[PDB]
Design a protein around this ligand. Sequence first.
Ligand SMILES: [Cl-]
Ligand SMILES: [Cl-]
Ligand SMILES: [Cl-]
Ligand SMILES: [Mg+2]
Lengths: 340, 334, 336
Amino acid sequence: YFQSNAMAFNLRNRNFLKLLDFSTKEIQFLIDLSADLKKAKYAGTEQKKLLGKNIALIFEKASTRTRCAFEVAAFDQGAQVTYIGPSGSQIGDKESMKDTARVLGRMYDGIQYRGFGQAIVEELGAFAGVPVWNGLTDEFHPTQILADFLTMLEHSQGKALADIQFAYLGDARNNVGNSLMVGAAKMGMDIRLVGPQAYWPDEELVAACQAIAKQTGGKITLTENVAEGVQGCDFLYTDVWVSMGESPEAWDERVALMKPYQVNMNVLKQTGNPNVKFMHCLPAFHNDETTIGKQVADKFGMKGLEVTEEVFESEHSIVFDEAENRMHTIKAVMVATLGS
Amino acid sequence: MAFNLRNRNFLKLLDFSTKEIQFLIDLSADLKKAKYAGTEQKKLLGKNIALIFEKASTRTRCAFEVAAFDQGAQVTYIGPSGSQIGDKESMKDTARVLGRMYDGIQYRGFGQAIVEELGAFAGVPVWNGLTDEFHPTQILADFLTMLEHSQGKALADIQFAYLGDARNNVGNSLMVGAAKMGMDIRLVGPQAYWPDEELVAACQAIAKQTGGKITLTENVAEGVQGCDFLYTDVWVSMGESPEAWDERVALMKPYQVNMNVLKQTGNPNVKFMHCLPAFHNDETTIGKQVADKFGMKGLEVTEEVFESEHSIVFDEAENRMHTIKAVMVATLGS
Amino acid sequence: NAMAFNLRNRNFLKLLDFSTKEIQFLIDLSADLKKAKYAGTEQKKLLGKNIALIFEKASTRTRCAFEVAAFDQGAQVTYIGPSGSQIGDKESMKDTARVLGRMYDGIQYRGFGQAIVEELGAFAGVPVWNGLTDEFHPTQILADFLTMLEHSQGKALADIQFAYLGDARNNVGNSLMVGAAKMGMDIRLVGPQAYWPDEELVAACQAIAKQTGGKITLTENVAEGVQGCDFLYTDVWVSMGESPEAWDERVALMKPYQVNMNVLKQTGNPNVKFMHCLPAFHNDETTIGKQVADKFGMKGLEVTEEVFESEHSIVFDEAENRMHTIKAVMVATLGS
Ligand SMILES: [Cl-]
Ligand SMILES: [Cl-]
Ligand SMILES: [Cl-]
Ligand SMILES: [Mg+2]
């Protein structure tokens, strides 16, 4: 080790609310720590850093991966958890977030929140007096992108993040697209957002990310042209075209518009890269074995929406590794911020 | 045997041999005794388990949770809402995600095919806490209960009758179970509600190799004669209102378990069993409605039978936990 | 000493089931567990115990308090939350209790009528703890009493005076009155007469108070009710499971019993502290509190933002104390 201890010190007791709050080196540290926790777990060697800690998991919206990842990470690390689901949160109905935060802060050692506006999780993080972690808001999904970056490194045969190029296809203005962009800029990556112009991320956020990328040697491109957007890419990433809490009416105008950005074998071919890999944050509509995906695909005469079955189940697909990595990276966040 | 059960799924009794099942029951008895003596050894220490419930059932859920906790495991309960399951995400995808994070997975839900797909794709042991077709954990508990209440008689020596609607998961599983263990079972109920004929035939073939016996009849007196245990279950549909129940009630009524039926066994030591919940009085809102509408205090069983010295329903309910514990310990335990 | 032995395996269903000294022992035990936790010295008395948490109505504080208390003490919990079926719809409480009692070492219940939790307590065969019913909320009042002692500079409970404002016939009002009487306190219930506690309960509390040197007063008069008080307490004017229509004819009636700075002033006590069981409607940062206040042109309902956020307010200490006191209950009744 000639490895700087600065980042571990600086992460203690921090919140984890969005990637904008962290430096390039803090993010890289979290990723490295994830890889170490993953290896220790696989070897049966894990040391518990959250022993006797109690954590509250507030979910104002649904979750499989994120909830499970927080629970399993906590359990592995010796913590106990209270899961408060959508019909359990009183928040903003009967009790303010300020009040809730102060009450939970007195009983728990750490708090996860998944919900609506970034402003809510920021208020929670300002008032709880303990580390608060964002498990998804309307604007950002930071833990997902940690997982994505660990996954890219593992699947890149020695290449660093600064050296990787990737394209995100579809609706770029969603939490995942925003976080991928902030992330790419911070780590010095080359990201292409490839989708209809009306769904590019907020201009203000793009400009802040362009400024970050200039200092890190990263690169950000927005385009409607699939062939140009995906050329040379190591990874292709997509997500369901409609977000959590949006009405079924959102699918009316979006499909014909989003259709040309579907990830299919042809798109993988246009990368020119036989080693291209496919990523997706999940859940995905890639066949008819989903009630919603079946009806929508049928309604518009399709077989799979944002990605096809052939791509999803091909050897190019690394979605299940990526999913597993949610737990390891969330573990790193809790260990760095709350671990002793 | 112990070696052979490691990492198996527990999806239905048809997947196991007579001796495997007996091993599970024996292991249950041992774990029960160890718990009672304060002597229990934890075999699931460091294990994390996901409990998927697509339809709620607080009894099966509680048995999994208590069994896991006693054995040093931690659990994540995923109930009918708050998940992404059946609707936003396929079972194949869910299975592969959960399998990466958890060491074992319980599922309670709809078709056997779903729990089979989960079991084929998760990469870890998957346990069936109830599907439309089978309810294997309930029958383990039932068999342990019978052995405990039979003064040293083995299962092969026991005779029992199940009354009512035999065409569902508990009836199916009792029949598969009886056949495997060489028992003498009578299914006593209207012919239209006997189990699937294909399943009966497969059970008849099993019963031949084990010296078991299977009888289906509409005759109560003949069905219950000589029985050590009488078993029943709710026979109206829970998805339906008490207003829809007229036909089914009149049809099932003569198979009610009441004191007379116990008498017709000719066995003063006969015991009464029920998987629960049970409609045995007018204390509930649904019991009040039924009492008003059909002039009946209790449906499949009467209050007098349910609360009598013959009833072992609460021992049977406690045994859900000890048996579920054995399943997890045998398949995942270190 | 005697009290510890006498509490083992008891239910905790209402304060009317305990003696003065048992309550004081619970409070003392709470303070000891609080200190042990803060010092990293806590001994786990509930190791290997499994506890069922039945919630038929919503909770933040009470659920969390039970979970954290159980975890700190080495227990594990199963949370069974509100659904479309209540116990008694399709399975009796008598059946449920006997099944849970075979699997769990202790059971919490929050729900509707006190008769339900009494039935659970009669049939479970293990200690059963009332986390709130229509009639009573006993764990809340333990927490309140610990909090008052901590904020009273060595004064005992018998020496404290406090007023509860608003709808006095709710679970918290009833339990504060039973509590005051048991511990020899001077309580004033200050609210419209139609919302005073049942006459049968008042009379039982008056008889208790007489032998403890406590005092109970009911009045519609704020000034006279709050004069000389160490603590002022209030709660939301409409209870859980009442219809949203209840607000409409209750706000105007309750409005004069709002806790605002004037009221604090009428105590004549510069050291007066403010308490609330929570949650509270004190500004526009909830959809319900904003809509109801807006309907009558108000800012805050039962308490104002200014009072809620002032140095007089000890509501967050009070909330933290829910956990320490719930822990005492479990440890005394079930703790090996
Ligand atoms: Cl982010
Ligand atoms: Cl089976
Ligand atoms: Cl009380
Ligand atoms: Mg482990």
